Design a protein around this ligand. Structure first.
Ligand SMILES: Nc1nc2c(ncn2[C@@H]2O[C@H](COP(=O)(O)OP(=O)(O)OP(=O)(O)O)[C@@H](O)[C@H]2O)c(=O)[nH]1
Ligand SMILES: Nc1nc2c(ncn2[C@@H]2O[C@H](COP(=O)(O)OP(=O)(O)OP(=O)(O)O)[C@@H](O)[C@H]2O)c(=O)[nH]1
Ligand SMILES: Nc1nc2c(ncn2[C@@H]2O[C@H](COP(=O)(O)OP(=O)(O)OP(=O)(O)O)[C@@H](O)[C@H]2O)c(=O)[nH]1
Ligand SMILES: Nc1nc2c(ncn2[C@@H]2O[C@H](COP(=O)(O)OP(=O)(O)OP(=O)(O)O)[C@@H](O)[C@H]2O)c(=O)[nH]1
Ligand SMILES: Nc1ncnc2c1ncn2[C@@H]1O[C@H](COP(=O)(O)OP(=O)(O)OP(=O)(O)O)[C@@H](O)[C@H]1O
Ligand SMILES: Nc1ncnc2c1ncn2[C@@H]1O[C@H](COP(=O)(O)OP(=O)(O)OP(=O)(O)O)[C@@H](O)[C@H]1O
Ligand SMILES: O=c1[nH]cnc2c1ncn2[C@@H]1O[C@H](COP(=O)(O)O)[C@@H](O)[C@H]1O
Ligand SMILES: O=c1[nH]cnc2c1ncn2[C@@H]1O[C@H](COP(=O)(O)O)[C@@H](O)[C@H]1O
Lengths: 491, 78, 491
């Protein structure tokens, strides 16, 4: 009882070949012994950061500001906030991602009893929340005198500046508290049992040292996949360039609490980028660096030698990109992902496959070819969390989608354009769309017979995972064909 | 979370199966005849023995083998 | 000194390959030592028929009836008259081609002196000419009593009904004549010196044996390339099927004086076709037979063994054709032409490359690959000489272009359609368009460095002629590209 070997290994697929794209090949089906829902999508972003989902939103001005980065992190991916903005704007976007979910809030909004209901309303306007502990100084480290929330100031008619907070607080005698040096789980038990919405943390001197909010425990149960640091804040990435003024931007982003930096370049194998990696790794040794838009092992070597914690793979793929028709330079993305990942895995360096991801099948191909994570631009553009506003043109709801080497982006929003500037049709919310991509990746892995992305890659490197090349007519046959009209209702 | 594996489309009218399947039958018979096969059983035996020969097509052979070079046409099958 | 070898030989181009079309390759340029106008286009149609031009009009109901066949023969090609018509209609189309140019007219229209001016006008209405010798019987072999022409009946208004020809003729006393047994060249000298428009040929008994017309000497100087038989009539081809009733059609076409028969089939390697070739070669040993739409040497063998004088090459190419998507069956035409011609040349059997000829570059490729002649359907459709009438549809002057297995042709104009009943935009006259194709073939051969189609084929078989295979992007680069609009003003 024997059956002959069928299809190519990945090593065979890229050996006797020109550069393949994701469209040029299929994965052959395996054996299914498991449910798609039990497929593990745990992914290394860098040497020290693991995501529950392989998915990254690209650092583009039409893709990733704070709402996208929050939504991606809540879905168990991450967002890298774009750098086509002032350093102060970018750091404020990073701060919004880091403030959205909290363990101990150690720098809350605080007011004095001498402040007013108008000051609580203006605080709610600036920071988005009404739950404000009150201390004698109105600064964080002071003796606690009460707590003010929206239930204390709501349905007061108009006496805003007229009313001092001392008359409006829940006074410190009435408030439930925990001692300093309580663990987060112990503070959560106290808060959960108290049935209150805030729990202040106070030392033996009765002065405020932290506070915790019930809404973060709600965000816990609401978002099981969420990408969080050790102090339970969302993970945030940010882009920086490799110019000297990017050192100032990097300092603002690091004090804003950014977890990972991506060095943003067309061609990352440069003296400028290697110098920036060395500068970061000496000044901020805690900070993860993804360097390198690279497409060859020779480029990957120089950045792994410089000490990057991850690599970005792709050049001239990417929906919006024209680098290949402007510089002659790049690689077919499936070949680039395979070549760079097969090399970078020897050093324990994870790969991000960046650009040309049009479909969830392309995500499964990128992951199968050795990418540990996948970065999307246009596939997440025209979601609700993507920056800017919808418009109508051809009777179609469209959002702008620009590209960062677009000459319109380079107006600080001879110079050479490396991107066009375009539009994409509406997609709805990341919070529904990323669960569709997750379940699509799981069903892809299931048809392949892989229980996780880790076993999927090991099946690929051992040659258990088999591939078939597609003729152009196989790419037609594998697409929608032969119909008059069709309705591509994904999820 | 509820993964679609197909789209939903439309196709133009074809008429009855009781006329269309006799057209497919006769097309299969004419294909086998141009090939020199008296039955689908002998067609498969010619294929496995290597008597049946195939040629690969470039994309331009797929263009040349279709309708080409016309302003418009009328695909009046049966 | 030395220069390295560049490009593939034809043997290499088809060896390590899938089936190529004409679009899939180029011919590499040679050395030019001659003018394009001195490129010899002399072509074998069959073992015994040589044309001055490689060009054939296809036997289709929307391409070749008598006007097309006359025009093709005058341009030094040939037409094959289609068979999707009654045997009597097809033989009458052949008769029109054979009557258009004459050496000795040995079966002229003749009248009695007791016929009338009205009988001469009715004769002119039926046969197209007014020059009618008069014999006392009104039958050919009888005593010459005079000659009547249009200048004799000219401007006789309504005197038609009862004016006997006796008083209208130029009488036999006045007419210039030649003796029987005069050569055509000698009769032409007598006619040319006489300054008359007819010269009757009479025996010593003074009875009519032939006549010659000055208009045939005019047709001589007007058409230097013209394809003529030994008695100076135009060459005509005709199609026939291989059914039993085609034996009757073949008898009508042979007594109408057809020079060459083409056996019309999608797949000519059949017992039915081999039987028809044997039947023709025993019943009509003078008659040239082109058998075989064939695409392999194995098919060609059986018809060359049956005794065909030429082969048609092509299956499922052809603008109008759907045989491949209806029968799975055929071959890429460049490969078919090369394979069959390289085999058939060993037996001295010429090849017609039939169908898929969209451009004069495809003609040069077909001839370079070993075709001795090229047959066109759609490229000659919507010329003025093509059958039927023009119409307008999309604001475009169109003519119908049908195909012979199409389901509109097979209604005597379960049935399986092998063609698609379409339309082609106007091209103007064959008498202008074929000189353009001739000049294009000559400039193709000149860029290649071939002084004739015979040396072109010899350079191909010796491997002196080099080919380069084309990517799809070379086919884009080789076409019109990068323009907003263009005007393809050929000739
Ligand atoms: N106050 C607070 N407590 C948190 C937060 N995140 C987690 N915790 C607490 O720490 C525990 C951690 O266990 P899990 O919930 O299994 O792991 P997690 O990765 O931290 O959170 P999930 O995102 O829900 O998976 C939770 O039960 C909470 O009590 C947060 O943002 N704020
Ligand atoms: N109150 C408060 N919440 C903060 C602060 N910084 C971040 N947050 C987060 O914002 C959220 C507060 O949620 P809630 O407790 O529902 O908000 P609230 O304070 O009651 O204010 P309202 O919803 O406006 O009534 C939690 O996820 C907090 O972690 C801060 O200084 N104070
Ligand atoms: N009456 C007549 N004489 C002809 C005809 N064709 C040729 N001739 C005569 O034969 C001569 C030989 O002509 P050529 O030019 O050598 O060769 P051809 O193929 O016969 O004629 P072309 O068609 O002009 O090439 C001409 O000069 C005429 O005198 C014809 O159709 N009718
Ligand atoms: N006259 C004549 N010409 C014939 C006959 N059969 C074929 N033809 C050809 O038709 C053409 C006759 O041309 P002309 O001599 O110009 O015709 P015509 O006799 O002057 O008559 P009109 O043109 O009507 O004045 C020549 O090419 C002949 O070879 C026939 O029976 N009689
Ligand atoms: N730790 C606490 N101990 C006692 N009272 C508290 C405490 N935290 C908040 N309060 C008081 O409880 C009331 C509700 O505040 P809480 O944070 O629980 O809900 P809220 O977020 O304001 O309610 P809601 O979501 O409906 O707007 C207010 O009067 C507030 O001052
Ligand atoms: N061989 C001949 N000998 C003498 N007269 C002739 C001869 N052939 C024709 N004719 C006469 O010559 C005259 C002109 O006839 P011919 O054939 O030469 O020209 P046509 O074709 O009739 O002239 P056109 O082209 O102008 O219409 C007529 O009267 C005719 O009867
Ligand atoms: O202007 C540009 N030129 C070249 N590459 C760009 C430009 N802007 C963004 N990119 C790349 O394109 C990727 C997104 O590609 P997409 O997912 O196919 O739309 C980004 O993550 C970048 O790597
Ligand atoms: O109905 C048909 N089906 C298949 N082949 C046809 C049919 N009618 C004509 N042909 C072929 O198509 C050739 C003309 O092709 P074309 O020059 O490309 O237009 C003819 O000479 C025939 O060999």
């Amino acid at each position: 009882g024997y059956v002959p070997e069928d299809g190519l290994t990945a090593q065979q697929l890229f050996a006797s070949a020109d550069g393949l794209t994701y469209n040029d090949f299929l994965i052959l089906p395996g054996f299914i012994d498991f449910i798609a829902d039990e497929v593990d999508l745990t992914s290394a972003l860098t040497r020290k950061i693991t995501l529950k989902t392989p998915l990254i939103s690209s650092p583009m001005d039409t893709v990733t500001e704070a709402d996208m980065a929050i939504a991606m992190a809540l879905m168990g991916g991450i967002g890298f906030i774009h750098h086509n903005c002032t350093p102060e704007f970018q750091a404020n976007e990073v701060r919004k991602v880091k403030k959205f979910e909290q363990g101990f809030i150690t720098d809350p909004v605080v007011l004095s009893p001498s402040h007013t209901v108008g000051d609580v309303l203006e605080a709610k306007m600036r920071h988005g929340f009404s739950g404000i502990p009150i201390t004698e100084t109105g600064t964080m480290g002071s003796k606690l005198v009460g707590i003010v929330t929206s239930r204390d100031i709501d349905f007061l008619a108009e006496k805003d500046h007229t009313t001092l907070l001392s008359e409006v607080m829940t006074p410190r005698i009435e408030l439930v508290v925990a001692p300093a040096g309580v663990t987060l789980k112990e503070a959560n038990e106290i808060l959960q049992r108290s049935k209150k919405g805030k729990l202040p943390i106070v030392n033996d001197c009765d002065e405020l040292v932290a506070i915790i909010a019930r809404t973060d425990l709600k965000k816990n149960r609401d978002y099981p996949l969420a990408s969080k640091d050790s102090q339970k804040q969302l993970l945030c990435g940010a882009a920086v360039g490799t110019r000297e003024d990017d050192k100032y931007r990097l300092d603002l982003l690091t004090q804003a609490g950014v977890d990972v930096i991506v060095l943003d370049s067309s061609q990352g194998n440069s003296v400028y980028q290697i110098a920036m990696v060395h500068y970061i790794k000496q000044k901020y040794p805690h900070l993860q660096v993804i360097g390198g838009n690279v497409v060859t092992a020779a480029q990957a070597k120089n950045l792994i030698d410089a000490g990057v914690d991850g690599l970005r793979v792709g050049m001239g793929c990417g929906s919006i990109c024209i680098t290949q028709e402007v510089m002659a330079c790049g690689r077919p993305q499936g070949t680039a992902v395979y070549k760079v990942a097969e090399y970078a895995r020897r050093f324990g360096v994870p790969i991000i496959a960046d650009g040309g991801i049009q479909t969830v099948g392309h995500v499964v191909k990128a992951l199968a070819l050795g990418a540990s994570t996948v970065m999307m631009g246009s596939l997440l553009a025209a979601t609700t969390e993507a920056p800017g506003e919808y418009f109508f043109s051809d009777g179609v709801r469209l959002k702008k989608y620009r590209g960062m080497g677009s000459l319109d982006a380079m107006e600080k929003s001879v110079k050479i354009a490396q991107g066009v500037s375009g539009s994409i049709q509406d997609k709805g919310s990341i919070q529904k769309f990323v669960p569709y991509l997750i379940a699509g990746i799981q069903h892809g892995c299931q048809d392949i017979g892989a229980r996780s992305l880790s076993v999927l890659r090991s099946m690929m490197y051992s040659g258990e995972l088999k591939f078939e090349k597609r003729t152009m007519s196989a790419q037609i046959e594998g697409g929608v064909h032969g119909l008059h009209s069709y309705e591509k209702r994904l999820y």
